[PDB]
Amino acid sequence: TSLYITAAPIGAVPKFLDPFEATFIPSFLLEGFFDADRCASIAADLKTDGWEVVPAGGRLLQVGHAQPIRWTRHPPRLAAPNAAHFPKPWLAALSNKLARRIVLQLTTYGWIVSEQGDLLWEHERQHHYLPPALIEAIEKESPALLKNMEEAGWIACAAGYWQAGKARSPYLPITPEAITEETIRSMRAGAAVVHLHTRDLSDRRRIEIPGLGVVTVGSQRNQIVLDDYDAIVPMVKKREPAAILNLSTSVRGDRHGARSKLRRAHLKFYDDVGSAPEVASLSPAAVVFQGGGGYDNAPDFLDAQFDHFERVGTRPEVEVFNHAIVDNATSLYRDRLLRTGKPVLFMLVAGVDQYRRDPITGEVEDDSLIARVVREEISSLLADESADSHRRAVELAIGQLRPVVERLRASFPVSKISILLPGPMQNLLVDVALGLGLDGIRVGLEDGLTVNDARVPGGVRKARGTWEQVSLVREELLGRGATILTAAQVRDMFGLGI
Ligand SMILES: [Mg+2]
Question: Disulfide-capable partner of 94 in 22, 32, 98, 124 (CB 3.0 to 4.6 Å)?
């Protein structure tokens, strides 16, 4: 059965990282150049922005970065511009796990893999830091590598604060302009539908630290930003009118927003475009992440959502986070879902651990589509990094999902079902989707920040963008003999935007 790709370029969780910014702040600058409370307040802000305290033992490579106050008289100029790189044999000296650790960190900082599998940094400035734990691992596995790095200008550091960029990407789009650009690139790479979030950047600010420059903090909080969509919707459709926009109505990060009209205020007729958004998310039960941060979807709220979607001509995409949603969608909300138009759309949020809470006792229990114990087994299998364990993992995933797909298709014979998986589980994505006879596959920085790349040791790096993940999933699908639908084909067969 033919497939359409959904691109999900922004999401709620990951953050943008500027690879030009300092990634390490030594404690001596913070404690020496500010008084006790100002030093303490900055530090708290760094922790809020994901910086972590590290002891001495790290390495810092810096070029053209610091302004004057191994410094001289001025920061060290031990590294000549454009000279820094990690030749493939440097990384091939390491175990798979350690090589991957390094590549993942440097590609978070904007380094790229060449066609020769070298790691390159293609700019004339940087302030890139590796923590003591990593340097220790390298010194144990390959003392010679560390000496090569030091000779290239990787310099020992004291204690301080490290911006690892965990769950960050230098390619995450968080502005209307960046989101429009990525939306268009993902479509050109082959995505038929683009699933969007916006972010509130109103709290961003620059902290200036002498002997280092400026570090930028801010929540980048997931928020439905009406002015951003007022920009994005026409900006996209002036260039690509075929765009099938699927707007998040989620209030992840903000549970108090879950009853508000705001959750449908971006689902309006956009005059500049002559249309409402094609698709928007709808979850017919509370979404309670085992990891925290969920949001309710109350029956009265849902009634209002359905009325609104029907009125403006937006097709719900049912976000199947949990078994509660399957139960509810196939029973009480069945006829309401048919009213909003056929085919009814579903997205299996597979691989993400979920609770269901008992209203009476307040106790929670597992409600995941892939039961947590099974999900945990799958993760363990994927960690074996073997064909034999991968095959077992696919069986387990398929085994858990098959009854869910059968129930959805039994209740909704005219339906389209897609799947997503979190980044570290995505090697299963194609096998699982094809194995289940699904109509679609979703990828993007919302779900995972990485891609496989056999050219580089360790085999894994940060994606260059959602468009790249789209490109790679499209290529794998085509190679398996699959048919990929275009936006224009998806619009027609789904009867969307009408
Ligand atoms: Mg989303």
Answer: 98
Which resolution in angstroms does this entry have?
2.1
Same domain, 161 and 52: yes
Distance 23 CA to ligand 1 centre (A): 29
Distance 408 CA to ligand 1 centre (A): 21
C-alpha 38 to ligand 1 mean position (Å): 37
- The strand pair at 168-169 and 59-63 is best described as unpaired
Pair (42, 5) in one structural domain: no
Strand order in the sheet with 85-86: 85-86, 119-120, 112-113
The token pair at 150 is 């030091």
63 and 157 share one domain: yes
CA of 496 to the centre of ligand 1 (A): 19
Domain of 70, in residue numbers: 18-165
Q: What experiment produced this structure?
A: X-ray
Check whether residue 91 and residue 146 sit in a common domain.
Answer: yes
Instruction: Tell me the C-alpha distance between 411 and 331, whole Å.
Output: 8
Residues 4 and 69 in one domain: no
